[PDB]
Amino acid sequence: HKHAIPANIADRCLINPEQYETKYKQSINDPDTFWGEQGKILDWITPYQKVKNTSFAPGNVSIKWYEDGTLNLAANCLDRHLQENGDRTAIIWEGDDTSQSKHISYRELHRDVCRFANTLLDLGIKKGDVVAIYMPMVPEAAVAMLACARIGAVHSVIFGGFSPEAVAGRIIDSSSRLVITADEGVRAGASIPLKKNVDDALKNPNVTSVEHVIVLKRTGSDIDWQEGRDLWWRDLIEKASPEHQPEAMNAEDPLFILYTSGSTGKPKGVLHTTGGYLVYAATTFKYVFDYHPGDIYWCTADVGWVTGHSYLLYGPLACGATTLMFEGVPNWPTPARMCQVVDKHQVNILYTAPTAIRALMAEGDKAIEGTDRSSLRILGSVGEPINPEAWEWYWKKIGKEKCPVVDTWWQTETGGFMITPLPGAIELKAGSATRPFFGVQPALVDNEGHPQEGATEGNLVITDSWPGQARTLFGDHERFEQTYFSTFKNMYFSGDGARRDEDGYYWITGRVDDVLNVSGHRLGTAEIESALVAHPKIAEAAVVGIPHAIKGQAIYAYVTLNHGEEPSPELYAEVRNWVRKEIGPLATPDVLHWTDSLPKTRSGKIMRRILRKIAAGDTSNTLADPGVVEKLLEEKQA
Numbered sequence: 001h002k003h004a005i006p007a008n009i010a011d012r013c014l015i016n017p018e019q020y021e022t023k024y025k026q027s028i029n030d031p032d033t034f035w036g037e038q039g040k041i042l043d044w045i046t047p048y049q050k051v052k053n054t055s056f057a058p059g060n061v062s063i064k065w066y067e068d069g070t071l072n073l074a075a076n077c078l079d080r081h082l083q084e085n086g087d088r089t090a091i092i093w094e095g096d097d098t099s100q101s102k103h104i105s106y107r108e109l110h111r112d113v114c115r116f117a118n119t120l121l122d123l124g125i126k127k128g129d130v131v132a133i134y135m136p137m138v139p140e141a142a143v144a145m146l147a148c149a150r151i152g153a154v155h156s157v158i159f160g161g162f163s164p165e166a167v168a169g170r171i172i173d174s175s176s177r178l179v180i181t182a183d184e185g186v187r188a189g190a191s192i193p194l195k196k197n198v199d200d201a202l203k204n205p206n207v208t209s210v211e212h213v214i215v216l217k218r219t220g221s222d223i224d225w226q227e228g229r230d231l232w233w234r235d236l237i238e239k240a241s242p243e244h245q246p247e248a249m250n251a252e253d254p255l256f257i258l259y260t261s262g263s264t265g266k267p268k269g270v271l272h273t274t275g276g277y278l279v280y281a282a283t284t285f286k287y288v289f290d291y292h293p294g295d296i297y298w299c300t301a302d303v304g305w306v307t308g309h310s311y312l313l314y315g316p317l318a319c320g321a322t323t324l325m326f327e328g329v330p331n332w333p334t335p336a337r338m339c340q341v342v343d344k345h346q347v348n349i350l351y352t353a354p355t356a357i358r359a360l361m362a363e364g365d366k367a368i369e370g371t372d373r374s375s376l377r378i379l380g381s382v383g384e385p386i387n388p389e390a391w392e393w394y395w396k397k398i399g400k401e402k403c404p405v406v407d408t409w410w411q412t413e414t415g416g417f418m419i420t421p422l423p424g425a426i427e428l429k430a431g432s433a434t435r436p437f438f439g440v441q442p443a444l445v446d447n448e449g450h451p452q453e454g455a456t457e458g459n460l461v462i463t464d465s466w467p468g469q470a471r472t473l474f475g476d477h478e479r480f481e482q483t484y485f486s487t488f489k490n491m492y493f494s495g496d497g498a499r500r501d502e503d504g505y506y507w508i509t510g511r512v513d514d515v516l517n518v519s520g521h522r523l524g525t526a527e528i529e530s531a532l533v534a535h536p537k538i539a540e541a542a543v544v545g546i547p548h549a550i551k552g553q554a555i556y557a558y559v560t561l562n563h564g565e566e567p568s569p570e571l572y573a574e575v576r577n578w579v580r581k582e583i584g585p586l587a588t589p590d591v592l593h594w595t596d597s598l599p600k601t602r603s604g605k606i607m608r609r610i611l612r613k614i615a616a617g618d619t620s621n622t623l624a625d626p627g628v629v630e631k632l633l634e635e636k637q638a
């Protein structure tokens, strides 16, 4: 069943059903005219002439948009709003402790970004240098990111929940010259030891590139200090000039890297450039959230993830919006926190994740108790499939049956929304991402690469480029080709499956590759296997996901110990804590299945479908030793 577009949205919407159809058609039939005009959402220092210049061809994957144009992202997100909107709040910051908040005007944000841009330059950071940012959800994380972009440095934001080992790996791969961090993060009443984690990471002997660590005194806790290397945020910024002239960057200058888990190996740095990325971020934000001047917008995603890059910071600031940055979690101190934040700051647009929605739904009316929620006009969901029932609960309880829900499918590699409703254009189906965005040509293919027509299911590919597309993997364009453009030739393979219904609506069913989705976190099964195998007692490991009401998927690890070793309950917690140390809490296995019965072909291939099935609780429906299946079932029952 479809939800109709409500009258209030019809009355204000930037894109109606007719306009979506018209614009979508032009975007496909004439990308140069379409994106040529749409690119004017940004200010350009030297105008572009070329618009679309892309290829997905074998051996010739090359993605360029607006390539002869120049611009500055920070001028688009800050400077150009100053004359008329300097006094407008750019960032509302809400502390974990509600007694703590700030409204940061465009003018104040610009001033600090200029100070910090000069701070970076004075420290010897140059255009093209990579800067690691390992920060909690505080406004200074935004300042750091915007200052890096302003001077053309390439920020690489590392999610604050990653372990020292995970932080070291990212620093090593990117050759980061500087780490920006805080003494501690504050989340749900608890402290995260960020600087200490940096300290431990930098002790890795393979870290050779870091010259300084800039530290924000957030809590003022006791921390170790390395004289010469470590520098206090306040001491530097107070000394810095508030005057900084932005310089022209080429459209195709690198903007940021984000380490992203894949089907094979360890996370790789997904690279975005400047022009097409920002155009796409601004355009998707504006149209999908139907943003009007004055709308208070709140995306709940951490700055450490792509959603935080595109839809907490860059898209909203480019459009001159007020964006809310929340330090804490949607359910602390109480499940009603998210809606208390909504009421306190009169949020009109809320964009959150199914894991959060499921967590609040489990508490029922405790999630809305004593809250009003009337300021909301638009709801959004991102990061994982949303089951219809959760969708309906979100729509009914948070939106009060008054707000369109925009379920936005996309990925780190795509820069911005790819398949999504537009609230005044597209009638909603609970659990469906609905239609492709302007410039996006999706298709479904079988495992052999044959396009599947009509209402059908298959491997979800995108058959042409779009401005927000990631341009390479950091220092490895050949792997970029292999990973995304070799399975289905001349096509971008998302690694997701999807069904398309009779209306042409897409229903994304999840990864078809060996990538998990655990509480909205994208994780490779292979990286968890490597982390497990690095443990001195463990010989072999096979990791699969299982359905989980709360997390969406849980991590189920089949583990073979070195010959001579025997399991114990102490070993269970030891191995869990080991993975917590190797990667972080986000990757901790929910189940450890001690076995000597890993199911291998005669060649040595591990049969993963059976392990997936057994772990899910299936008892029904090539192997070197076929009697392993029986043993595995028995052990699963224990």
Ligand SMILES: CCCOP(=O)(O)OC[C@H]1O[C@@H](n2cnc3c(N)ncnc32)[C@H](O)[C@@H]1O
Pocket (backbone or CB within 6 Å): 260, 306, 307, 381, 382, 383, 384, 385, 386, 407, 408, 409, 410, 411, 412, 413, 433, 494, 495, 496, 508, 509, 510, 511, 517, 521, 522
């Ligand atoms: C979009 C921000 C998260 O980016 P990441 O690159 O970390 O994760 C991308 C993957 O998350 C899932 N995913 C994301 N959005 C949806 C969605 N709306 N529905 C179903 N699955 C989704 C899809 O499987 C996708 O391949």
